[PDB]
Amino acid sequence: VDNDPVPTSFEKWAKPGHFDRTLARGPQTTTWIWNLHALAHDFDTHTSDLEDISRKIFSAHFGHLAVVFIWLSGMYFHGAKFSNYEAWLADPTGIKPSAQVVWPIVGQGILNGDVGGGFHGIQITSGLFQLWRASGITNEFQLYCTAIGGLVMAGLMLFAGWFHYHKRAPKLEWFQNVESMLNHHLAGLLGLGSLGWAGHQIHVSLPINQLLDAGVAAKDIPLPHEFILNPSLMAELYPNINWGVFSGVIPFFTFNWAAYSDFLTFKGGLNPVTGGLWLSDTAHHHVAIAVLFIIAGHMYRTNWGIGHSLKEILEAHKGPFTGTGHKGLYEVLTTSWHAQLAINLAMMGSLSIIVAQHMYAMPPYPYLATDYPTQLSLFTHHMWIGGFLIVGGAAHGAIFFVRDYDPAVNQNNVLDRVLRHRDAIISHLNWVCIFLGFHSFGLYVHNDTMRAFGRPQDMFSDTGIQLQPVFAQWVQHLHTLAPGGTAPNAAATASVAFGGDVVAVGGKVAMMPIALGTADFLVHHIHAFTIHVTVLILLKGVLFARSSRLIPDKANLGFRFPCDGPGRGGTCQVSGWDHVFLGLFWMYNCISVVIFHFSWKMQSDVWGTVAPDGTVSHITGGNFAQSAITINGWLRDFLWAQASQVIGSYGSALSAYGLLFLGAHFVWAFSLMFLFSGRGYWQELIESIVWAHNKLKVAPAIQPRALSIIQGRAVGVAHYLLGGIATTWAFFLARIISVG
């Protein structure tokens, strides 16, 4: 840790482009400006030292955490002053969650449509109300002081960033101490947080929620301070511990947990009152998660001769096919920030996809399962975040290979031998992509052709040539013969999706078994195909970022270059950046098909209403099994049918969704101008417009230049992603607010 590395001053605020060398000679052309924002967070190009790069990264992470805390505090303030949270808590099913009361200036007040309870605002789909009920928050003053705490935490991260960059900045070995870091982040950052939230679940969340789950009508609960001050409130709630400040923790210290089994439960399933998870199960969950994470943060050698060096583990792990195995990966992963960013972005994208696929099927918060808006929104949001982060992990893998790969570090290790048979890897992935594309999409268009022919017996359907997903069905079977079988000490299954019975909260289905048929088989192989092609593009970018048979010196050209000219037949889009650019479209395709499958299968075979007698009437009435096998059925019974809500929205509270549906169509189509053209036309057109300006003594001193080839691709893919995702967003939200 140093003392005063950087003088805190406003001098360099006045100088755009101080951080680079090409960016401080004055902007002679327009491109400089774009390059400024293109080069701002490339700390590797600013200076050429790991220490300054790491200090920059540390205090940038501080600023990002400050921004996220500002966001958190904004959410809590809007829920504490501009929402209907207490009214929603009074009547969960009858009240939809809403916040963000728009200002009534030009039309917009129609978007404050009645959500219920007299409150007038935009219906929220983020599931924040459910989060606040699940955490044990009852009134809004708790959320208000949580907003205050979020603002003060944001101020703390802001000051910590200024402090750890400008005042006391760490040295390299502090950053390179991956041992102390991993021990602090398995145990100290994850385990402590899990334990403290269990300390919020043992004492606050479970009491408040158990009282709410009987009809106590909110307000008459004591405040959460009274539940540790008075164990007399803990008397009637699970009596079977002495419940004292010394006596109550004695059963933990004496291996006496059958007493704790009343609130540390392993029930599983769903609460048949709220449609959420059993919060006793989540408390026991966080307890076990905390303990396993604190155990896990005790395996790395820091200062006391106990623990593993990651290096001994890595360089030891090696086999007869992999040469020297992992010899050299330790140097790679403590020298390249990009090699770590690749893994961490890919892993967090996979976690976000997992979070999407988990919070729909074991709905973990009270009254979010029967809030189909919230459920659809949360799944689709986490799927998009996961796809974007995965493509970013591929991007920084390519960046690592271009900039931070050293052949002397990597000799006959797994990195080197992967590079030495990239051609076999890419050719086999190419073959898998073609096979999957044929035997999924060709199946779909075969079905379209036979349905048009009037040959339904010749289709790949449940009434024609059956393709039953037998493996997924048997895994579904083994999860329901397991809340009494292979998981004996457990009340209900992991989720009702694998089997069980219709969990019916209010008049609505919370979760029912999702049976898997031929249409599911087809759309799962479509998902596998789209994932494999995205993998093919991104892995080909990562493995060929350095060289190929076409360009043997791509590492000298860099990570972000347009081409190597029209020769060799034409070498457009050879860079790793352009492979990320193509993988972004293919991620869009994959995630779009995934969320379309989710929306249709949920609306067709799970969601709906439950009659007083007990008959489920699904929203689209089970058209999935016969219409999701053709492209015509997807076009008609999913896209054409369910878009009626977003296009009939003009004149109601859903009006903004129709407006954004159209605006997103516009932005997506605006993207194609950047995607299909090239900058030469635009430079020649800017030339004549420059003539028009030069005639009137008005041509600017900063020369107007068209965007670069890479910037043209970047703008096109950004507008394409923005428009397509926002189209699907507006469609989804309008449809599921109206029918859900």
Partner 1 sequence: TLPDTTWSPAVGLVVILCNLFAIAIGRYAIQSRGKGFGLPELLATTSFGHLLAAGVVSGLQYS
Partner 2 sequence: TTLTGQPPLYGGSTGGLLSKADIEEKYAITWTSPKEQVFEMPTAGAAVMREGENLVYLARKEQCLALAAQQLRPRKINDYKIYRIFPDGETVLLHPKDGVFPEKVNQGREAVNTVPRSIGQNPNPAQLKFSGKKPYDP
Partner 3 sequence: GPGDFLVHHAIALGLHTTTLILVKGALDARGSKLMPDKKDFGYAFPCDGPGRGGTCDISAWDAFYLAMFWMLNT
Ligand X SMILES: CCCCCCCCCCCCCCCC(=O)OC[C@H](COP(=O)(O)OC[C@@H](O)CO)OC(=O)CCCCCCCCCCCCCCC
Ligand Y SMILES: CC1=C(/C=C/C(C)=C/C=C/C(C)=C/C=C/C=C(C)/C=C/C=C(C)/C=C/C2=C(C)CCCC2(C)C)C(C)(C)CCC1
Q: Which of residues 480-539 bind ligand Y (CB under 6 A)?
A: none
Residues from 562 through 591 that contact ligand SF4 (CB under 6 A): 562-563, 565-566, 570-572
From the list partner 3, ligand Y, partner 2, none, which binds 487 (C-beta under 5 to 8 Å, kind-based)?
none
**Is 162 labelled a binding residue?**
yes
Quick check: helix, strand or coil at residue 194?
helix
Among 6, 68, 153, 491, binds ligand Y (CB under 6 A): 153
Query: Would you say 37 is a known binding-site residue?
Result: yes
Q: What is the DSSP string of 303-352?
A: SSS-SB-HHHHHHH---SSSTTTTTTHHHHHHH-HHHHHHHHHHHHHHHH
Letter for the amino acid at 648? G
Any binding-site annotation on 431? yes
Closest by CA to 469, choosing from 424, 515, 534, is 515
Residue 180 annotated as binding site: yes
Q: Which window, 20-28, 195-203, 231-239, 669-677, contacts ligand Y (CB under 6 A)?
A: 195-203
Name residues contacting ligand X, limited to 558-577 (CB under 6 A): 560
Cβ proximity to ligand PQN: between 482 and 690 the closer is 690
- Indicate whether 34 belongs to the interface with ligand X (CB under 6 A): yes
Residue 287, binding choice from ligand CLA, ligand PQN, partner 1, none, Cβ under 5 to 8 Å by partner class: ligand CLA
For residue 23, give both structure tokens. 């960016």
Residues contacting residue 361 through CB under 8 Å, at least 6 positions apart: 495, 496, 497, 511, 514
423 binds, among partner 1, partner 2, ligand Y, none (CB under 5 to 8 A by kind): partner 2
Question: Alpha-carbon distance 287 to 645, whole Å?
Answer: 44
Residue keyed to tokens 């090239």: 678
Residue 674 binds: one of ligand PQN, ligand SF4, partner 3, none (C-beta under 5 to 8 A by kind): ligand PQN
Residue 125 · residue 733 · CB < 8 Å? yes
Beta-bridge partners for 123: 98
By CB under 8 A, tell whether 306 contacts partner 1.
Answer: yes
**Torsion 546-551-553-559 (CA) sign:** negative
Residues 33-52 binding ligand CLA (CB under 6 A) are 37-42, 46
Distance CA 154, CA 64 (A): 9
Q: At its nearest, how many Å lie between ligand Y and the CB of residue 145? A: 8
Question: Under rule CB under 6 A, which residues in 673-712 are in contact with ligand PQN?
Answer: 673-674, 677-679, 682, 706-707, 712
- Tokens read off for 293: 């994470």
Shortest separation between residue 683's beta carbon and ligand SF4, angstroms: 12
Q: What angle do helix axes 372-403 and 337-359 make, rounded to 10 degrees?
A: 160
Contact assessment for residue 396 and residue 342, using Cβ atoms and an 8 Å cutoff: yes
Residue 298 site contact among ligand CLA, partner 2, ligand PQN, none (CB < 5 to 8 Å, cut-off depends on kind):
none
Q: Is 680 exposed, middle or buried (0-12, 13-18, 19+ CB in 10 A)?
A: exposed
The binder of 304, among ligand X, ligand SF4, partner 1, none, by C-beta within 5 to 8 A per type, is partner 1
Say how far residue 647 (Cα) sits from the centre of its chain: 28
Distance CA 275, CA 506 (A): 9
| Residue among 40, 41, 54, 43 at smallest CA distance from 2 | 54
Looking at residue 400, the DSSP 8-state letter turns out to be: H
The annotation status of 284 as a binding-site residue, yes or no, is no
Residue 197 assigned as binding residue: yes
Residue 159 binds partner 1 (CB under 8 A): no
Please list every residue from 192 through 231 that binds ligand CLA, using CB under 6 A.
195-196, 198-199, 202-203, 228, 231
**Per DSSP, what are the bridge partners of residue 618?**
608
108 labeled binding residue: yes
Whether 164 has a binding-site annotation, put simply, is no
Sites of contact with partner 2 (CB under 8 A)? 323, 407-408, 410-412, 416-417, 419-424, 543, 546-549, 552-553, 555-556
d(CA 591, CA 340): 25
Amino acid at 23: L
- Binding-site residues for chlorophyll a: 13, 18, 37, 41, 56, 61, 64, 71, 78, 100, 103, 108, 125-126, 142, 162, 165-166, 174, 180, 184, 197, 200-201, 203, 244, 285, 298, 307-308, 317, 326, 357-358, 365, 381, 396, 417, 421, 428, 431, 439, 446, 455, 471-472, 479, 486, 489, 524-525, 532, 560, 577, 673, 681, 693, 711, 719, 729
- Binding-site residues for chlorophyll a': 665
